[PDB]
Design a protein around this ligand. Sequence first.
Ligand SMILES: Cc1cc2nc3c(=O)[nH]c(=O)nc-3n(C[C@H](O)[C@H](O)[C@H](O)COP(=O)(O)O)c2cc1C
Ligand SMILES: O=[N+]([O-])c1cc([N+](=O)[O-])c(O)c([N+](=O)[O-])c1
Length: 363
Amino acid sequence: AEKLFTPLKVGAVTAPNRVFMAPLTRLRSIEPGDIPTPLMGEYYRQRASAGLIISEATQISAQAKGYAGAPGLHSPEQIAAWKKITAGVHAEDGRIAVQLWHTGRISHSSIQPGGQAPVSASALNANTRTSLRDENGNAIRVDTTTPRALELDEIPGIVNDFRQAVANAREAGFDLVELHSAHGYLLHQFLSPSSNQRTDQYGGSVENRARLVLEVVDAVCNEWSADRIGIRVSPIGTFQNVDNGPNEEADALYLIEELAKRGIAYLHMSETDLAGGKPYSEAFRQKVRERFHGVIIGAGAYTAEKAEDLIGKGLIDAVAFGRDYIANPDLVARLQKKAELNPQRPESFYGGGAEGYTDYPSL
Ligand SMILES: Cc1cc2nc3c(=O)[nH]c(=O)nc-3n(C[C@H](O)[C@H](O)[C@H](O)COP(=O)(O)O)c2cc1C
Ligand SMILES: O=[N+]([O-])c1cc([N+](=O)[O-])c(O)c([N+](=O)[O-])c1
């Protein structure tokens, strides 16, 4: 069609096209153990024609767990299972990044270590729901538990958990890592004034609110290499009840300038929540583009036409598609041929088994 099907260097790897698979929580891991499965391996292998696969959000630690059925990357059994998944993608000549998260306050005590309260920047309930499993293994929605504020002396341990999870990602065969700094999860809970009322060096000013994420970026670049690190941000608008405060544009540009200093592989911008939000102006896209010198990935209700427009204008380099990738394993070939897409079945986005997961056909 036009530029979507052309190669792009993304840090240490080269994508053959600009059609990426966005990170998508599907809640099909084995419990106990939060272990990836052969069925997950098949799902990712089906999608290996993507320019880059970004995995579902994956826990850096047991404390990081927010949803029943989300996988981890902290135990030996998890590492071994992910190695099989990455090897399947590579057998199909694909590339895969792991999205690493800590859910912070979007969690429930029943899935935390010891059954205790989850942690956050401050002791404020998320006022949302998470997904648990019932006695028959089926996904159910439950109100989030009020968190405890992290003590200052606990912050280095959070940094260390990200560091260790990146070392584990490298062993598991991932090509890149994506830090989950978006959507109201732990790193975003520190970034946003709505969720961060701290009076130490980790709250107040934008420099203090960004301190934790930038300590994490520095630690993971040191552990592996900057050209292996990406980050997902959602810095404009409201996401899962977390807004970006009264100075969101200036605060976003500060963060992006700081990330640029580290020479990381990519910046992945989640532009809108699933419930919608105001579109990015071209002027703001230009301000982002002049501050970041790696790859920029756009996401959020994109069409191929919008992607072509913005790639052609030189404002973004690639697009991540979420729900179209759930339903279309061969999305690249379908967009290239202008073929129809399979219809989406949202009732099977979370939990369950093969149905609504590996049963969407290729052309
Ligand atoms: C079922 C589902 C699960 C999601 N899980 C994640 C997640 O693990 N990590 C993340 O950063 N975003 C997650 N998202 C957001 C998607 O990555 C994506 O930004 C969003 O679906 C909008 O893009 P789309 O219109 O192309 O689907 C999820 C979205 C859906 C629909
Ligand atoms: O539905 N989900 O399970 C879901 C999960 C995650 N995540 O990282 O755990 C997200 O970032 C989003 N999201 O950003 O929209 C959705």
